[PDB]
Amino acid sequence: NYYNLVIDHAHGATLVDVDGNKYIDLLASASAINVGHTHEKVVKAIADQAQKLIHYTPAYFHHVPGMELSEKLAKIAPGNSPKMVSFGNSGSDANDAIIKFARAYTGRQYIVSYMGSYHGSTYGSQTLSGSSLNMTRKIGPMLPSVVHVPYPDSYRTYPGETEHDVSLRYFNEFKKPFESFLPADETACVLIEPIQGDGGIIKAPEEYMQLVYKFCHEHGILFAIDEVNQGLGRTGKMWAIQQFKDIEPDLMSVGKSLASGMPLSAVIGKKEVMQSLDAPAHLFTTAGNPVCSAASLATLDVIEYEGLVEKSATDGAYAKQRFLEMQQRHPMIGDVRMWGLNGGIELVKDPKTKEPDSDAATKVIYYAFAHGVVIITLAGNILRFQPPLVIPREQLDQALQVLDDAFTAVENGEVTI
Amino acid sequence: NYYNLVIDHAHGATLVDVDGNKYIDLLASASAINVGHTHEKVVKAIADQAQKLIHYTPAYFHHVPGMELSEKLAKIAPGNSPKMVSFGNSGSDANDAIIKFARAYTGRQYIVSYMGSYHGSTYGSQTLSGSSLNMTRKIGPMLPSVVHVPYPDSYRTYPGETEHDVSLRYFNEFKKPFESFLPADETACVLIEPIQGDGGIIKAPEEYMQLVYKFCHEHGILFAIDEVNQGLGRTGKMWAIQQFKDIEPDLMSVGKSLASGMPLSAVIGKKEVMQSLDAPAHLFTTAGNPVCSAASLATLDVIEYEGLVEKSATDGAYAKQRFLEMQQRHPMIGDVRMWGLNGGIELVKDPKTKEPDSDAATKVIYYAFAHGVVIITLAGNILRFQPPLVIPREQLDQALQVLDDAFTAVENGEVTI
Amino acid sequence: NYYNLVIDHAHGATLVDVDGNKYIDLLASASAINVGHTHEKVVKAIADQAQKLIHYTPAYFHHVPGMELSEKLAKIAPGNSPKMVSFGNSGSDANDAIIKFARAYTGRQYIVSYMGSYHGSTYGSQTLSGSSLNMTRKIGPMLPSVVHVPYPDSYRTYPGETEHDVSLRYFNEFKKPFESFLPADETACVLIEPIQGDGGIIKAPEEYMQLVYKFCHEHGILFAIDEVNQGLGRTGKMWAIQQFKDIEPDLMSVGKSLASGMPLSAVIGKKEVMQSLDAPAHLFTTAGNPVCSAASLATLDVIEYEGLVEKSATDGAYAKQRFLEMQQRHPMIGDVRMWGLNGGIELVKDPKTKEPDSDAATKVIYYAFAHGVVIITLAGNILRFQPPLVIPREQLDQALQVLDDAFTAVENGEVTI
Amino acid sequence: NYYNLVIDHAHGATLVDVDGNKYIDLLASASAINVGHTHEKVVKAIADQAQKLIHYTPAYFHHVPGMELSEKLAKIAPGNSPKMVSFGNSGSDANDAIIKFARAYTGRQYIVSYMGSYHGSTYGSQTLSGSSLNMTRKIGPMLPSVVHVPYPDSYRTYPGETEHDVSLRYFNEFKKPFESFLPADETACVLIEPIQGDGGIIKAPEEYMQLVYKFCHEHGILFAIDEVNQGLGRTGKMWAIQQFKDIEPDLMSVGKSLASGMPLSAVIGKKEVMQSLDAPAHLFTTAGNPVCSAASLATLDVIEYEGLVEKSATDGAYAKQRFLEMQQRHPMIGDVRMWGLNGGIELVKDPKTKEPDSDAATKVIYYAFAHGVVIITLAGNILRFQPPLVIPREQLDQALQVLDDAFTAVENGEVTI
């Protein structure tokens, strides 16, 4: 909680509290609500399925929604290699499964993940994460044979560094463990967020990603991606990895928006990799639930038929220009990062020092809340802008104007915590 | 897939495939269906909630169903100490949370669990597990600082051993790591299933359980229980741990039946233990989902209103009697174990050698399936008996008669694989 | 410090402090002094080699003592298979090397060792150990993928158990992990002390050892032995494993007496196992030191020339009968375990309860010390009897008389701590 | 075996093989032989002790050389805080002990060590290591809760980077894991080579070292140093850490040259840190061997009496000039690093690209060997220069001229393997 709000109902990008007050949702429940709240087609799909079968573990009997969803997810995944899908409940358990699939297929034990990453809260995925110290404190020891590498930062760079220089420097950092203590032939996979979500909406440069991808292929390391936050149209392409040229992951984790916030996740992977493990050795009883699966079928169709991928791209381009214009009048805005309706607005004390301004960031979100918009922060000083992709233009403009007013009010000293 | 069969719809304890064939459910989807399939109150709760709010992450904003469920679960948990509740999506993640809370509260690392145990498929919970069925081939290394001890087997005992002798022998095995390499003062937690589900419906004797509970208290080791399979009325008490005298767990995992097979789980623990961690330390985006929460509220209401606990105790004792009578005519039944509607029928080659007859158990399964009843085996030779608690007596008797006929056909060599 | 006493010099089985006081050594510095203190032939070997070459790391240049010892150790190892040897500095690092060799050769992770065992003090060997709890306390997490099983106890048995029943019970416990959570095809080796040293001079029954050995052969698990305490003639055979019928280990650790207490250890293993790893990957700078190697060549020569294996066998049988006769007069002696000049004298409060009497044990060692004999306890209540193998009969009889007097004085309450 | 030749005898910096061929030693058995081969004072100390007492485990009885050495090591260790010493056999076990002392004193789990480091071949010290030459292939999983950070590289730097810029960039890398997944408050220790030996004779800049030292003190992390290769006058100070301003380590490992290559090591630590662990919990049987202890007393004496600290400083400054002069005529020499008689001469394909030239390096080694000098490489392309500190000027000049001719011959293409 940030402000003790109790939601009674919601539709599209609008939240209504128990009292009747209205809010514009710029969070979409951490990008679980790409399709907007209570989308008519998803509600109906949930209702109709519940009438027939609430649950049977698909490992004992197939159900139609699970069969249909498994085929479809295999189709829409990036690349042309034959795919298989394994269902879970959460992004967390999907990233735990990624570790399992990679170890079992390769016969290798080490996993490489990123500082700044967030992969979930189960013991495997929580070890991979590098987003929060409180995810390691008191609960160790963690999963063995996990190595963290730094994710490329395009904002706080060295003087005179180009995109090319940053890519090379961070790739050299990527190689350092492999040239010292970490055998590449013993690394099962690299797990990467094509754009880091919780880390602050940070996109790896094209050249950096191509270097890692090639490194993996050349050493027989699996290239895995986490699309749990950045997938299903969020970046203005179906998959965040499609922001890069011709990269097909060996394993991909999908969650959050998948079933409009119903607990469903998937690992989608190359056929051969996915066949190294199955039920009943790896299984979640309520995973691939038929009600959740019907919910997902409807939400996937909504993304396609309402053109939400295209809308995220064009609205994202627009929101990027609006925030850039705001940056010209508000020097507290240090960096505008936007790929689709998917933004990190980084607030700094000074543009030259780039020193984080967590105080100002919290004031903005407090102002916004008092003026009917829900927005939160990342890593202290970064506003996350991830509204449902269905957000009508009038509501988007309304929210942007509140944010512009927030910046002015924080400048004048008119906001207190 | 176990049955290679597509389920179309289901109600109560009757399953209907895509060709209209009817089946009596003696599996209840691994005891996730205590309240029976598509219960009228649960379907309505799901459909009504979906219309208002499909999802918002409870870590940002509260919703009424989640808050009400949190209160109700704290109230119905065993013991009189004030509890806190932490939601997840799966039993697996609830067991991961137990490791976290125990380690955080005690400041110790080691977790003790049992051989034969099943706790889930994430990296924490699957380390704790000890069923041959869900073993960790190809996926290691697992979570460090986990020791397995043997679970008391009251069937294959040494000649002349009483329940007293069994309790003492197994408690002596329990103490052996603590008297060698495992420091009691560095063990955070002992986690036990009060009755082992996947292990074969095996109940720890009263005296063994008291000895462990006391050992934990004397050394400041938390005593945790897994009620994911055996909870919510399955044993003919609300919780399996209530089959024992005056035992309040520090930590308890709950799942499967909690929300009628909708993905929801909980860790319910003593207030002090639960306060040792933050969250972000333990959070899932879709955990405590309002549709799932409303479904759970309704299944809990059904357990109360239809007196399902008492019905489980009553039908359980009936089913025990019935199988005991069958045992008198079919010496292939080596052991009848039953606490509530919750039975392990163990098949053997000879009454004295107690050699497992996995082939005979396979043949019973086939016969039952060919005759309209769904039942599975555990450990090859144990028939597991876990119908929905709502199973009408008429249907229970039908299933029981099919089982009787299966034993007859198997004796006479009339079933072929 | 155990005795709080400065040794000036020593020879054979006699120790001399800085005051001139003489002691009979029944410890032989934890069996590192099989050949007796300052043996003339060993002293000469040390001095002559120190004038030629104190050290060069044999991984850069070979030296003649190292090459000769390497061939000698390959030849005297139990069995007929071609062997190779790898040198270390301590028993501990030899056991660390066993883990390495087994994991490297098999491509598997898990190591099985015994409760009650002692393998050393480095992170690998100390994880495998299971005697002192202090050895795990405060220093975790330890090496992952290690499982401890119980070592067969022939003294505190169930009423009416034969040696056959003991072997079968303990072999059943051995198998329990493999039938639950531990995959046999993922375990690299079993490390076993053929007689447990620090465990209390406990010998696995023949039948037990055969069952484990066969289990290992059948599953491709390496069968590894620790001969650091019990090797080099201590049991009245060259190797403790030779007390068993036709067992050739895949790997064997040797230390302590190898170089008369100079730091030198070895792993002796089958050729194909030993070639799975080499220097410079696995290497200790001062391992295979030419002075230590010359000392070792000399001590091995003494064992042969003075017939110390047979002398241990015949003096050990004599000493066993002496302790058996003491036992008749002194009921505090519950168990006499003795194989060669290698004994555990177990002290108990009552012969039927077998309750440990640590108090009587420490009083015996106090009396012995005040009367010119050095002897210590294991596990509180067991007198450890391991004199140098060269101990003259007159001196052995002298020490045995003091112990008889000690037992009489402890009975009469004449000893105050 | 590196050279395929058998050493028969050696004295000072000259080695003689079995055929009578003389070699000048620029390896000194990886810096185990600081005081020169078979030094008269050390040979005599070995022989004289061997006559009195070859061994007794000093945990049972004190011996005089062990007592004197313990006092002398506590005295000559850097800084003015009271120290305690714990003996081992090898640098590997001393570094394993460092982990143990740090975890036990702090009650924290995590250990930070460096890429490019070498700390030994036991499971603890080998996990900490980061030398490609000592990779842990096939032997995992390793010790849990170990994080590697990059060591400052002052040769392959970014354009226009100063020593200051290097110190700040590498300190920024040091902090990255602490700002992502590694809690400072849960890390027990940072272990650092003041100059990395096996890493290629790489010295951390003063400013970097002060930053790490300060960070450790401010977070309650123990600051540990490894002086096994770089201690005992090798750098031209007694300890390599004395190359830096006012740094007193909490823990220091010492070995290799400590007893002229006899197996002996020590952890020297602040008194309150060392008291956290005891014996018999932590103990090696043959550690602090009296013959080894006597050898060490004599080598320490030679270091003082022959003024070898000063000799290394002035011969090293001389050797740096000679190699710098060679660099002028031989552009294949990319970098000359030298602190005492202790150098890394790095060979490259081109002065601007700095591409490593391993082929040129192995050819130089081969030529040198063919003309009577012993020298090896590190990291493929770095000539390592560590002769005994006693090397007479005439012999040094002789060896330096052979190296000069080697560069000439490789340049002209006259060397083939």
Ligand SMILES: *Cc1c(COP(=O)(O)O)cnc(C)c1O
């Ligand atoms: C939220 C998130 C997860 C974990 O998903 P849950 O459903 O909360 O377990 C994993 N990866 C990324 C990138 C996320 O944003």
Ligand SMILES: *Cc1c(COP(=O)(O)O)cnc(C)c1O
């Ligand atoms: C099935 C089960 C679990 C795990 O639940 P999932 O929802 O399948 O993760 C945990 N414990 C027990 C006793 C179980 O039967």
Ligand SMILES: *Cc1c(COP(=O)(O)O)cnc(C)c1O
């Ligand atoms: C003492 C001992 C060790 C360890 O030897 P160190 O040389 O003290 O490291 C290993 N195994 C056994 C059986 C021992 O008695």
Ligand SMILES: *Cc1c(COP(=O)(O)O)cnc(C)c1O
């Ligand atoms: C050689 C070395 C060690 C290990 O010493 P051993 O005696 O070979 O175990 C540790 N640290 C450094 C810096 C070394 O050079």
